């Protein structure tokens, strides 16, 4: 398992514009199009992202291209963030995937506010970090996914994702 397989499990794959868990227009493997209520605004964002007139539908190859771009953006975002980079650099490979997953889902400024959890993760206090991470809107709104990500942080193994 790697970050692509992990997020593909968590985000799924849909080739037509859909609404994510928060009700926002999204496409592909969790590619957020807009937080605007307007489907037309989303369709415009999609056409801009893909570079052709899509009429709300893309191919699997296009979805995977957006996915590559989004994962890269998440990682780069972490590396450019003064609060996130040192924690990320302190982590092992598997836990780094859990970190990218959170930033992919909630964005960099969002996770950068997870201050107490970040400290515990940098200190390698895994059980404590796991407990702290669950005290969050994140956990309460998407508990099944949060539990998988937290288990990954707690154990540094892919146990939560085996058997998908
Ligand atoms: C809060 C988990 C985390 C750690 C490092 C970087 C991003 C996210």
UniProtKB/Swiss-Prot annotation:
Induction: Expressed late in the viral replication.
Substitution effect: residue 26 to H: Facilitates transglycosylation more effectively than hydrolysis; covalently bound substrate
Source organism superkingdom: Viruses
Catalytic activity: Hydrolysis of (1->4)-beta-linkages between N-acetylmuramic acid and N-acetyl-D-glucosamine residues in a peptidoglycan and between N-acetyl-D-glucosamine residues in chitodextrins
Binding residue positions for substrate: 32, 104, 117, 132
EC supergroup of this enzyme: hydrolase
Localization of this protein: Host cytoplasm
Similarity comment: family membership: Belongs to the glycosyl hydrolase 24 family.
Effect recorded for residue 11 to N: Loss of 84% of enzymatic activity
Result after altering residue 20 to A/N/S/T: Complete loss of enzymatic activity
pH dependence: Optimum pH is 7.3.
EC number: 3.2.1.17
Documented effect of changing residue 30 to A: Almost complete loss of enzymatic activity
Example of a GO MF term: lysozyme activity
Entry-linked SUPFAM superfamilies: Lysozyme-like
Identification of the protein by name: Endolysin
Gene Ontology terms describing biological process: cell wall macromolecule catabolic process; defense response to bacterium; peptidoglycan catabolic process; viral release from host cell by cytolysis
Record-linked HAMAP family: ENDOLYSIN_T4
Protein task: Endolysin with lysozyme activity that degrades host peptidoglycans and participates with the holin and spanin proteins in the sequential events which lead to the programmed host cell lysis releasing the mature viral particles. Once the holin has permeabilized the host cell membrane, the endolysin can reach the periplasm and break down the peptidoglycan layer.
Residues the record marks as active site: 11, 20
GO cellular component: host cell cytoplasm
Consequence when changing residue 132 to M/F: 2-fold decrease in enzymatic activity
Keywords: Antimicrobial, Bacteriolytic enzyme, Cytolysis, Glycosidase, Host cell lysis by virus, Host cytoplasm, Hydrolase, Viral release from host cell
């Amino acid at each position: 398992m790697n970050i692509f397989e992990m997020l593909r499990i968590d985000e799924g794959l849909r080739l037509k514009i859909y609404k994510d868990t928060e009700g926002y227009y999204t496409i592909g493997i969790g590619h957020l199009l807009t937080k605007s209520p307007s489907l037309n605004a989303a369709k415009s964002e999609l056409d801009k992202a893909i570079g052709r007139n899509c009429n709300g539908v893309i191919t699997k190859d296009e979805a995977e291209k957006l996915f590559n771009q989004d994962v890269d953006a998440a990682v780069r975002g972490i590396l450019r963030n003064a609060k996130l980079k040192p924690v990320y650099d302190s982590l092992d490979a598997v836990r780094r995937c859990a970190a990218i997953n959170m930033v992919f889902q909630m964005g960099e400024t969002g996770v950068a506010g997870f201050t107490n959890s970040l400290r515990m993760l940098q200190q390698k206090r895994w059980d404590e970090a796991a407990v702290n991470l669950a005290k969050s809107r994140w956990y309460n709104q998407t508990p099944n996914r949060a539990k998988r990500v937290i288990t990954t942080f707690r154990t540094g193994t892919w146990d939560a994702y085996k058997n998908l």
